[PDB]
Ligand binder design. Sequence first.
Ligand SMILES: CC[C@H]1OC(=O)/C=C/[C@H](C)[C@@H](O[C@@H]2O[C@H](C)C[C@H](N(C)C)[C@H]2O)[C@@H](C)C[C@@H](C)C(=O)/C=C/C=C/[C@@H]1CO[C@@H]1O[C@H](C)[C@@H](O)[C@@H](O)[C@H]1O
Ligand SMILES: CC[C@H]1OC(=O)/C=C/[C@H](C)[C@@H](O[C@@H]2O[C@H](C)C[C@H](N(C)C)[C@H]2O)[C@@H](C)C[C@@H](C)C(=O)/C=C/C=C/[C@@H]1CO[C@@H]1O[C@H](C)[C@@H](O)[C@@H](O)[C@H]1O
Ligand SMILES: Nc1ncnc2c1ncn2[C@@H]1O[C@H](CSCC[C@H](N)C(=O)O)[C@@H](O)[C@H]1O
Ligand SMILES: Nc1ncnc2c1ncn2[C@@H]1O[C@H](CSCC[C@H](N)C(=O)O)[C@@H](O)[C@H]1O
Ligand SMILES: [Mg+2]
Ligand SMILES: [Mg+2]
Lengths: 250, 250
Amino acid sequence: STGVELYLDLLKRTVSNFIYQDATHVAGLITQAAFVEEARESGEDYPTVAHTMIGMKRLNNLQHCVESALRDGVPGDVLETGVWRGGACIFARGILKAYDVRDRTVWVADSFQGFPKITDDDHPMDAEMNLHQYNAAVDLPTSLATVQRNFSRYGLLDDQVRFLPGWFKDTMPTAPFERLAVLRMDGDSYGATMDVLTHAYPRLSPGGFAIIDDYCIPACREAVHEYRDRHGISDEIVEIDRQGVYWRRS
Amino acid sequence: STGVELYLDLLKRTVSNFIYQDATHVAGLITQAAFVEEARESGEDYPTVAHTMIGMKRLNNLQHCVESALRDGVPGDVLETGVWRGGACIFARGILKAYDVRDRTVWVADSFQGFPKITDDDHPMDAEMNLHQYNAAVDLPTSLATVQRNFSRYGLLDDQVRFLPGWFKDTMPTAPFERLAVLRMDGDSYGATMDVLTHAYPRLSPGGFAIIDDYCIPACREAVHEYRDRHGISDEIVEIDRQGVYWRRS
Ligand SMILES: CC[C@H]1OC(=O)/C=C/[C@H](C)[C@@H](O[C@@H]2O[C@H](C)C[C@H](N(C)C)[C@H]2O)[C@@H](C)C[C@@H](C)C(=O)/C=C/C=C/[C@@H]1CO[C@@H]1O[C@H](C)[C@@H](O)[C@@H](O)[C@H]1O
Ligand SMILES: CC[C@H]1OC(=O)/C=C/[C@H](C)[C@@H](O[C@@H]2O[C@H](C)C[C@H](N(C)C)[C@H]2O)[C@@H](C)C[C@@H](C)C(=O)/C=C/C=C/[C@@H]1CO[C@@H]1O[C@H](C)[C@@H](O)[C@@H](O)[C@H]1O
Ligand SMILES: Nc1ncnc2c1ncn2[C@@H]1O[C@H](CSCC[C@H](N)C(=O)O)[C@@H](O)[C@H]1O
Ligand SMILES: Nc1ncnc2c1ncn2[C@@H]1O[C@H](CSCC[C@H](N)C(=O)O)[C@@H](O)[C@H]1O
Ligand SMILES: [Mg+2]
Ligand SMILES: [Mg+2]
């Protein structure tokens, strides 16, 4: 109903392409290419064209996290670790824009090359899963230049969008943000989750939100529990849909 | 900037599909399928997937006309005659939604079958052009149910959108609107333009806008001048882009 609500509603439907309803890649448990409403609603398919694969329920979750941070005066930026085509970060920048927020940044972190090749240093669950095998099949490698172009299409490429290109184990320890209000983790593997919890989570403000996109994946979940056990973190884990969870840092 | 401005901006870029940049059908003077930014900007291509073909300059014109009418208190509804997939009507409905206007309607008038088969009742310029020949090539015939579906994808199918299915010569004389603030004519032919000027233009409020999408088409232009000459209409014809013009009713 308000201009703000209308904009953010359309922005979600647009970055997930409920508007034009692109086919999905046939991969994983998806056995047909046709668009299925319930799969895009829950972020369960692999869009051929859409700018995000997280789906409406996880987009609604990101909106709730950012809005709650803003309402409650939780200081800091938004970081997403694993962005693909950039749709969820585009949406994040859009939320700031809708509220005319000029003092927070959206940090966009990725290899911009898809999943890394497995080495002997990987966690054995990451090695067995070998996410790198799927890069082309779902068009995962998405260059920095492409992501930036995608932001421009929505008129949201500006100096409150900053990019952190590279492997998370390399980029996160010295990433130049001071404080985060929302940390959205979407790198799927034990390694990526643990890199980001280790190196970015300490900068998450009290009251801020930690979102684990891929908690359904056993390697991801293992890292979340190892990390929480190590640091004494007991904040409730709340489910979003069939894949994602989040907690709010107390 | 404001929520409203951001919504209407995004809605334009969405119905014209500047977001995902679909190919064009190859037809008329368009010889290549690739998306070309300047052609989508000026509404000169035949989108394979986008909901309107009128392009950003003619979307912007529609916005200007509807907002001036609202601002100046010109009474009445919005009618578009020739709606194809419905994008320009979806956009009009979205303008009213953005300003929380609850007392005006968007009327959506089309054969829902593309251009009419030519008979010996048609104006000789319409018969020579034979627009009907291009129906399949630019995917023109678009059913009422498809247009309703498209509105629903934006959240804009409600009781302030009303449909007028049929040939304009049949639907216009008794169409149930009482007054119009904007009359957008997009039927291309002498016949479709003369049908709508004859039977709907008298209901256009003073201060209201008459938009001729296809003024570059000689048959359309002939109808426009015959009608203005007959009724003594001398209101300045203002050019929008390389196709459309409008005037404001004195
Ligand atoms: C297509 C790429 C995809 O791969 C699949 O979905 C693979 C599904 C396998 C076929 C499953 O195996 C089956 O289930 C049982 C084991 C009995 C089955 N049985 C026949 C033995 C066995 O066949 C998995 C359950 C295996 C486990 C290890 C797992 O969870 C692996 C996850 C893989 C995730 C990537 C999607 O990338 C990310 O997904 C995130 C969730 C998204 O948010 C998003 O970030 C996205 O980019
Ligand atoms: C594909 C559909 C299209 O067809 C064409 O573009 C055909 C172009 C012909 C090929 C041109 O002729 C050629 O020029 C040279 C002299 C070399 C050729 N030579 C063989 C002599 C000669 O043949 C035209 C100039 C002929 C004249 C009669 C004309 O204007 C016809 C109009 C046709 C309009 C429809 C566009 O649909 C509507 O357009 C609106 C503008 C939009 O707003 C929108 O509503 C849309 O739905
Ligand atoms: N260790 C690592 N370092 C940096 N990027 C990683 C990584 N492991 C996976 N990625 C990136 O993680 C992303 C997973 S898919 C992320 C989906 C995205 N959030 C969306 O809205 O659709 C891919 O873009 C991939 O390149
Ligand atoms: N005499 C007539 N009666 C009713 N509909 C007509 C007609 N002549 C043409 N049409 C319709 O006119 C439309 C021309 S294309 C309209 C483009 C649309 N305004 C957009 O935003 O993209 C087609 O949908 C066609 O079916
Ligand atoms: Mg994920
Ligand atoms: Mg036209």
